[PDB]
């Protein structure tokens, strides 16, 4: 799959970086 949205898990500000 090439949806990233957990690839390097952003719990900091924005939840889907990608």
Same mark, same amino acid.
Do not use: E, I
């Given at each position: &799959?090439?949806?990233? *949205?957990?690839? *390097?898990?952003?719990? *900091? &500000?924005?939840?889907?970086?990608?």
């Amino acid at each position: &799959k090439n949806k990233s *949205r957990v690839a *390097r898990g952003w719990g *900091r &500000k924005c939840p889907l970086f990608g």
